[PDB]
CSV table of N, CA and C in Angstrom, one decimal:
chain,number,residue,atom,x,y,z
A,1,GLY,N,18.4,43.3,-57.1
A,1,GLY,CA,19.6,42.6,-56.6
A,1,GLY,C,20.7,43.5,-56.1
A,2,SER,N,21.9,43.3,-56.6
A,2,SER,CA,23.1,44.2,-56.1
A,2,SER,C,22.9,44.4,-54.6
A,3,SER,N,22.7,43.4,-53.8
A,3,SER,CA,22.5,43.5,-52.4
A,3,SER,C,23.9,43.2,-51.7
A,4,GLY,N,24.5,42.1,-52.0
A,4,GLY,CA,25.8,41.7,-51.4
A,4,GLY,C,25.7,41.8,-49.9
A,5,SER,N,24.8,41.0,-49.3
A,5,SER,CA,24.6,40.9,-47.8
A,5,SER,C,23.7,39.8,-47.4
A,6,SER,N,24.3,38.8,-46.8
A,6,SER,CA,23.5,37.7,-46.3
A,6,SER,C,22.9,37.9,-44.9
A,7,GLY,N,21.7,38.6,-44.9
A,7,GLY,CA,21.1,38.9,-43.6
A,7,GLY,C,21.1,40.4,-43.3
A,8,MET,N,21.3,40.7,-42.0
A,8,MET,CA,21.3,42.1,-41.6
A,8,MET,C,21.9,42.2,-40.2
A,9,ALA,N,22.2,43.4,-39.8
A,9,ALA,CA,22.8,43.7,-38.5
A,9,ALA,C,21.6,43.9,-37.5
A,10,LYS,N,20.6,44.6,-37.9
A,10,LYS,CA,19.5,44.9,-37.0
A,10,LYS,C,18.4,43.8,-37.1
A,11,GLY,N,18.5,42.8,-36.3
A,11,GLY,CA,17.5,41.7,-36.4
A,11,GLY,C,17.5,40.8,-35.1
A,12,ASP,N,16.3,40.7,-34.5
A,12,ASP,CA,16.1,39.9,-33.3
A,12,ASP,C,15.9,38.5,-33.6
A,13,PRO,N,16.4,37.6,-32.8
A,13,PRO,CA,16.3,36.1,-33.0
A,13,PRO,C,14.9,35.6,-32.6
A,14,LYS,N,14.0,36.6,-32.3
A,14,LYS,CA,12.7,36.2,-31.9
A,14,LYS,C,11.7,36.3,-33.1
A,15,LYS,N,11.8,37.4,-33.8
A,15,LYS,CA,11.0,37.6,-35.0
A,15,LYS,C,11.1,36.4,-36.0
A,16,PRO,N,10.0,36.0,-36.6
A,16,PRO,CA,10.0,34.9,-37.5
A,16,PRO,C,10.7,35.2,-38.8
A,17,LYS,N,11.5,34.3,-39.4
A,17,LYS,CA,12.2,34.5,-40.6
A,17,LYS,C,11.2,34.6,-41.8
A,18,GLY,N,11.5,35.5,-42.7
A,18,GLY,CA,10.6,35.7,-43.8
A,18,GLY,C,10.3,34.3,-44.5
A,19,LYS,N,9.2,34.3,-45.3
A,19,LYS,CA,8.8,33.1,-45.9
A,19,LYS,C,9.8,32.7,-47.0
A,20,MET,N,10.1,31.4,-47.1
A,20,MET,CA,11.0,30.9,-48.0
A,20,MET,C,10.2,30.0,-49.1
A,21,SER,N,10.8,30.0,-50.3
A,21,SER,CA,10.2,29.2,-51.3
A,21,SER,C,11.0,27.9,-51.6
A,22,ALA,N,10.3,26.9,-52.2
A,22,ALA,CA,11.0,25.7,-52.6
A,22,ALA,C,12.4,25.9,-53.1
A,23,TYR,N,12.5,26.9,-54.1
A,23,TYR,CA,13.8,27.2,-54.7
A,23,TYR,C,14.8,27.5,-53.6
A,24,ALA,N,14.6,28.5,-52.8
A,24,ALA,CA,15.5,28.9,-51.7
A,24,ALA,C,16.1,27.6,-51.0
A,25,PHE,N,15.1,26.8,-50.5
A,25,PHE,CA,15.5,25.6,-49.8
A,25,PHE,C,16.6,24.9,-50.5
A,26,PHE,N,16.4,24.7,-51.8
A,26,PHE,CA,17.4,24.0,-52.7
A,26,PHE,C,18.8,24.6,-52.5
A,27,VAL,N,18.8,26.0,-52.6
A,27,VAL,CA,20.1,26.7,-52.5
A,27,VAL,C,20.7,26.5,-51.1
A,28,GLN,N,19.8,26.8,-50.1
A,28,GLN,CA,20.3,26.7,-48.7
A,28,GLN,C,20.8,25.3,-48.4
A,29,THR,N,20.0,24.2,-48.5
A,29,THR,CA,20.3,22.8,-48.2
A,29,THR,C,21.7,22.6,-48.9
A,30,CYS,N,21.9,23.1,-50.1
A,30,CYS,CA,23.1,22.8,-50.9
A,30,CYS,C,24.3,23.4,-50.2
A,31,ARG,N,24.1,24.6,-49.6
A,31,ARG,CA,25.1,25.3,-48.9
A,31,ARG,C,25.6,24.5,-47.6
A,32,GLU,N,24.6,24.2,-46.8
A,32,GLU,CA,24.9,23.5,-45.6
A,32,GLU,C,25.7,22.3,-45.8
A,33,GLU,N,25.4,21.6,-46.9
A,33,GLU,CA,26.1,20.4,-47.3
A,33,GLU,C,27.6,20.7,-47.7
A,34,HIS,N,27.8,21.9,-48.4
A,34,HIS,CA,29.1,22.3,-48.8
A,34,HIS,C,30.0,22.5,-47.6
A,35,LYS,N,29.4,23.1,-46.5
A,35,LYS,CA,30.2,23.3,-45.3
A,35,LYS,C,30.5,22.0,-44.5
A,36,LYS,N,29.6,21.1,-44.6
A,36,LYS,CA,29.8,19.8,-44.0
A,36,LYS,C,31.1,19.1,-44.4
A,37,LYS,N,31.4,19.3,-45.7
A,37,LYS,CA,32.6,18.7,-46.3
A,37,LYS,C,33.8,19.7,-46.3
A,38,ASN,N,33.5,21.0,-46.9
A,38,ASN,CA,34.5,22.0,-46.9
A,38,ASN,C,34.1,23.2,-46.0
A,39,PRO,N,34.2,22.9,-44.7
A,39,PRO,CA,33.8,24.0,-43.7
A,39,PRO,C,34.9,25.0,-43.6
A,40,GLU,N,36.1,24.7,-44.0
A,40,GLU,CA,37.2,25.7,-44.0
A,40,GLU,C,37.5,26.2,-45.4
A,41,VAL,N,36.5,26.2,-46.3
A,41,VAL,CA,36.7,26.6,-47.6
A,41,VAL,C,35.7,27.7,-48.0
A,42,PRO,N,36.1,28.8,-48.7
A,42,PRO,CA,35.3,29.9,-49.1
A,42,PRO,C,34.2,29.5,-50.2
A,43,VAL,N,33.1,30.1,-50.2
A,43,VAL,CA,32.0,29.8,-51.2
A,43,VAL,C,31.5,31.1,-51.8
A,44,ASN,N,32.0,31.4,-53.0
A,44,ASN,CA,31.6,32.6,-53.7
A,44,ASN,C,30.0,32.5,-54.1
A,45,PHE,N,29.2,33.0,-53.1
A,45,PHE,CA,27.8,32.9,-53.3
A,45,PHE,C,27.4,33.2,-54.8
A,46,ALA,N,28.1,34.3,-55.3
A,46,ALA,CA,27.8,34.7,-56.7
A,46,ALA,C,27.9,33.5,-57.7
A,47,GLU,N,29.0,32.8,-57.6
A,47,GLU,CA,29.3,31.6,-58.4
A,47,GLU,C,28.4,30.4,-58.0
A,48,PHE,N,28.5,30.1,-56.7
A,48,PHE,CA,27.8,28.9,-56.1
A,48,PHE,C,26.3,29.0,-56.5
A,49,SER,N,25.8,30.2,-56.5
A,49,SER,CA,24.4,30.4,-56.9
A,49,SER,C,24.2,30.1,-58.4
A,50,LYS,N,25.1,30.6,-59.2
A,50,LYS,CA,25.0,30.4,-60.7
A,50,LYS,C,24.9,28.9,-61.0
A,51,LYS,N,25.5,28.1,-60.2
A,51,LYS,CA,25.4,26.6,-60.5
A,51,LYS,C,24.2,26.1,-59.8
A,52,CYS,N,23.7,26.7,-58.7
A,52,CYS,CA,22.5,26.2,-58.1
A,52,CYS,C,21.2,26.6,-58.8
A,53,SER,N,21.0,27.9,-59.0
A,53,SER,CA,19.9,28.5,-59.7
A,53,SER,C,19.7,27.7,-61.0
A,54,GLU,N,20.7,27.6,-61.8
A,54,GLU,CA,20.7,26.8,-63.0
A,54,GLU,C,20.2,25.4,-62.8
A,55,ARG,N,20.5,24.9,-61.7
A,55,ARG,CA,20.1,23.5,-61.4
A,55,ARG,C,18.7,23.3,-60.9
A,56,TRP,N,18.2,24.5,-60.6
A,56,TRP,CA,16.8,24.5,-60.1
A,56,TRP,C,15.8,24.6,-61.3
A,57,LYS,N,16.1,25.3,-62.3
A,57,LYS,CA,15.3,25.4,-63.5
A,57,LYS,C,15.4,24.2,-64.4
A,58,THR,N,16.6,23.5,-64.3
A,58,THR,CA,16.8,22.3,-65.1
A,58,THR,C,16.2,21.1,-64.4
A,59,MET,N,15.8,21.3,-63.2
A,59,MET,CA,15.2,20.2,-62.3
A,59,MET,C,13.8,19.9,-62.8
A,60,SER,N,13.3,18.7,-62.6
A,60,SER,CA,11.9,18.4,-63.0
A,60,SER,C,11.0,18.4,-61.8
A,61,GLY,N,9.8,18.8,-62.0
A,61,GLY,CA,8.8,18.9,-61.0
A,61,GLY,C,8.9,17.8,-60.0
A,62,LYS,N,9.3,16.6,-60.5
A,62,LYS,CA,9.4,15.4,-59.5
A,62,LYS,C,10.5,15.7,-58.5
A,63,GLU,N,11.6,16.2,-59.0
A,63,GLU,CA,12.8,16.5,-58.1
A,63,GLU,C,12.5,17.7,-57.2
A,64,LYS,N,11.9,18.7,-57.7
A,64,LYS,CA,11.5,19.9,-56.9
A,64,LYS,C,10.5,19.5,-55.8
A,65,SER,N,9.8,18.4,-56.0
A,65,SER,CA,8.8,17.9,-55.1
A,65,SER,C,9.4,18.0,-53.6
A,66,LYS,N,10.6,17.3,-53.5
A,66,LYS,CA,11.3,17.3,-52.2
A,66,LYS,C,11.3,18.7,-51.5
A,67,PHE,N,11.5,19.7,-52.4
A,67,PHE,CA,11.6,21.0,-51.9
A,67,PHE,C,10.2,21.7,-51.9
A,68,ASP,N,9.3,21.1,-52.6
A,68,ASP,CA,7.9,21.6,-52.7
A,68,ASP,C,7.2,21.4,-51.4
A,69,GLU,N,7.3,20.1,-50.9
A,69,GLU,CA,6.6,19.8,-49.6
A,69,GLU,C,7.0,20.7,-48.5
A,70,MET,N,8.3,20.9,-48.4
A,70,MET,CA,8.9,21.7,-47.3
A,70,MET,C,8.3,23.2,-47.5
A,71,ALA,N,8.7,23.8,-48.6
A,71,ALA,CA,8.2,25.2,-48.9
A,71,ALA,C,6.7,25.4,-48.6
A,72,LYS,N,5.9,24.5,-49.2
A,72,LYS,CA,4.5,24.5,-49.0
A,72,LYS,C,4.1,24.7,-47.5
A,73,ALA,N,4.9,24.1,-46.7
A,73,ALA,CA,4.7,24.2,-45.2
A,73,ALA,C,5.3,25.4,-44.7
A,74,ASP,N,6.3,25.9,-45.4
A,74,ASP,CA,7.0,27.1,-44.9
A,74,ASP,C,6.1,28.4,-45.0
A,75,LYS,N,5.1,28.3,-45.8
A,75,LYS,CA,4.2,29.4,-46.0
A,75,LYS,C,3.0,29.4,-45.0
A,76,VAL,N,2.6,28.2,-44.5
A,76,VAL,CA,1.6,28.0,-43.5
A,76,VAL,C,2.2,28.2,-42.1
A,77,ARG,N,3.4,27.8,-41.9
A,77,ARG,CA,4.0,28.1,-40.6
A,77,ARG,C,4.3,29.5,-40.3
A,78,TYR,N,4.9,30.2,-41.3
A,78,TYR,CA,5.2,31.6,-41.1
A,78,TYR,C,3.9,32.4,-41.0
A,79,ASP,N,2.9,32.1,-41.7
A,79,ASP,CA,1.6,32.8,-41.7
A,79,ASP,C,1.0,32.8,-40.3
A,80,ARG,N,1.0,31.5,-39.7
A,80,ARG,CA,0.5,31.4,-38.3
A,80,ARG,C,1.3,32.1,-37.3
A,81,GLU,N,2.6,32.0,-37.5
A,81,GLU,CA,3.6,32.7,-36.5
A,81,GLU,C,3.3,34.2,-36.5
A,82,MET,N,2.9,34.8,-37.6
A,82,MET,CA,2.6,36.2,-37.7
A,82,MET,C,1.4,36.6,-36.9
A,83,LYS,N,0.5,35.6,-36.9
A,83,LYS,CA,-0.8,35.8,-36.1
A,83,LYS,C,-0.5,36.1,-34.7
A,84,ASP,N,0.4,35.3,-34.1
A,84,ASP,CA,0.8,35.4,-32.7
A,84,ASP,C,1.7,36.7,-32.5
A,85,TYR,N,2.6,36.8,-33.4
A,85,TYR,CA,3.6,38.0,-33.4
A,85,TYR,C,2.9,39.3,-33.5
A,86,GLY,N,2.2,39.5,-34.6
A,86,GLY,CA,1.5,40.8,-34.8
A,86,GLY,C,0.3,40.6,-35.7
């Protein structure tokens, strides 16, 4: 951990984004929603995550499903992309 950095400076918009897991999706989707309402409000990733991550473990396989179907496809999509890339 102890990264404190959302992304990087050296990165081309061409290369495929690393593989994401169902969990991540839950966190991301949650963020995008926060901006939709409070676009002009700060979001302490540190705290925001503490509430999200905890909500991921407390979730039931049924709920995670929504993020399971997506992630499951996020692994096959990226894999194929790498084939063409390198």
